[PDB]
Design a binder for this molecule. Structure first.
Ligand SMILES: Cn1c(=O)n(C)c2cc(Nc3cc(N4CCOCC4)ncn3)ccc21
Ligand SMILES: Cn1c(=O)n(C)c2cc(Nc3cc(N4CCOCC4)ncn3)ccc21
Lengths: 131, 131
């Protein structure tokens, strides 16, 4: 079955969280209900504020601020690598992190800036493996 | 580890989808970035349109409609049981479905109206078990 008896005796759906995330990524692909543009140098990325907040300490801080919560455009530090941001945005909507030898440093620096602790820790572990 | 090599050779995070959903429910609890009120008889439920759309065929249809996508208030059919709606809204944000002998009929009728196929199928299976 697609469900099981949970620890609290309630029925839990095994694939529900991943199916929700898949549907949120489908909305992103079709630009449905996206409510912010993240600007990274000459690059623009449309997204859903709630997903960004759910994945990043920096976005959580920005969108819980009474002044910034209403902004439709967010400019990141111009030092941020757009490819590193793209890889992390894709991870937020899929659970899949496309780490490669050529992007791991940029991805790690971007995850540190975005306050994505588990991603930072994972990048550090993979870097340590080559060293 | 909190990650594994996925089928596509990419690294996948095991708990990411459930952690995102947990954070979206935390935003709901604090009324952060909620952008719609669902009205069910004398009861009001605040939520995030994207989560509702990701979980329900009816909400997907409503919020992809050019006229309705902008509505901040959505009134459901007055025949809908508020407790059944509450149980389903909680399920959307948690993966946990609080089915009980006393609510299963209302939950099933509400899931049919909301076009939540897997929930409908599960209710039908549990009803069949007692019969
Ligand atoms: C540091 N950090 C990190 O690595 N990730 C993945 C983060 C996600 C959030 N996103 C939240 C947090 C949150 N609560 C923490 C604050 O008190 C209220 C509940 N609620 C919703 N969204 C924040 C920081 C993160
Ligand atoms: C019938 N039904 C159901 O049981 N559940 C749980 C449903 C969820 C959605 N939510 C979507 C669907 C969706 N795509 C289907 C339509 O073409 C584009 C991609 N994309 C995002 N969100 C819809 C119907 C559902």
């Amino acid at each position: 079955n697609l469900y099981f008896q949970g620890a609290d005796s309630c029925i839990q759906f095994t694939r529900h969280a991943s199916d929700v995330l898949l549907n949120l990524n489908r909305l992103r692909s079709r630009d449905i209900l996206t409510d912010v543009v993240i600007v990274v140098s000459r690059e623009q990325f449309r997204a859903h504020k709630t997903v960004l907040m759910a994945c990043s300490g920096l976005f959580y801080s920005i969108f819980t601020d009474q002044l910034k919560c209403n902004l439709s455009v967010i400019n990141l530090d111009p030092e941020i690598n757009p490819e590193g941001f793209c890889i992390l945005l894709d991870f937020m909507y899929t659970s899949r992190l496309n780490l490669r030898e050529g992007n791991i440093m940029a991805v790690m620096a971007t995850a540190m800036y975005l306050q994505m602790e588990h991603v930072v820790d994972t990048c550090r572990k993979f870097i340590k493996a080559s060293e």
